[PDB]
Amino acid sequence: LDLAGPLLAFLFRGMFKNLLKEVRIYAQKFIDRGKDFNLELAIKTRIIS
Amino acid sequence: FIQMSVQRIVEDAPPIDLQAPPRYLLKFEQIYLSKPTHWERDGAPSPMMPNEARLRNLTYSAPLYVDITKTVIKEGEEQLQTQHQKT
Amino acid sequence: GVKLLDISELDMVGAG
């Protein structure tokens, strides 16, 4: 019986994957322009919340 | 789920590596949750009682933060290892 | 394990 715990673990794992992909794309864009990225602007919190 | 599954999912994440050369590394180490706190329009944090969430049609939720270690190599091991706390 | 924070350690960055 999957309760709230492993259920939210599954959804949170998916959304963490999406967040990692998002920051990957952002930092790759900034690096390919030839400049270090800002970590704060990388995170899009609304993916999770 | 809060005490174990969240931290385990974070630590089990593969550390993101990025490359042009400039070799950027990202790692997530420690997690935090505050109490359920409402941020007003001006960003004032206030302890949100659940009856307010019922009455004001708010989602009874707590913020979540992570300590993030960003280690950048620059083709010559001049490693800048910054850390961002409560991100 | 996950640590807890008090409301006084929440900086006002959510307003900025």
Give φ, ψ of B28 to 5 degrees: -110, 125
Do B7 and C1 count as a contact with CB atoms less than 8 A apart? yes
Chain B CB contacts of A4 below 8 Å: 1
Do A31 and B9 count as a contact with CB atoms less than 8 A apart? no
Give φ, ψ of C8 to 5 degrees: -75, -20
End-to-end CA distance of chain B: 21
CB–CB of B20/A32 below 8 Å?
yes
Do B26 and A12 count as a contact with CB atoms less than 8 A apart? no
Scan for tokens 């307003």, then name that residue.
C15
Chain A CB contacts of B1 below 8 Å: 4-6, 8-9
Token readout for A21 is: 């992909």
Is A20 near chain B, with CB under 8 Å?
yes
Rounded distance, CA A6 to CA B1, Å?
Answer: 7
Q: Which of A33, A36, A26 is nearest to B73 (CA)?
A: A36
Token readout for B41 is: 């329009």
Q: Strand, helix or coil at C3?
A: strand
Q: How was this structure determined?
A: cryo-EM
Query: How far C9 CA sits from the closest chain B CA (Å)?
Result: 9
Query: What interhelical angle do A4-32 and B5-12 show, nearest 10?
Result: 30
Do C7 and B65 count as a contact with CB atoms less than 8 A apart? no
β-strand partners of B68: B28, B84
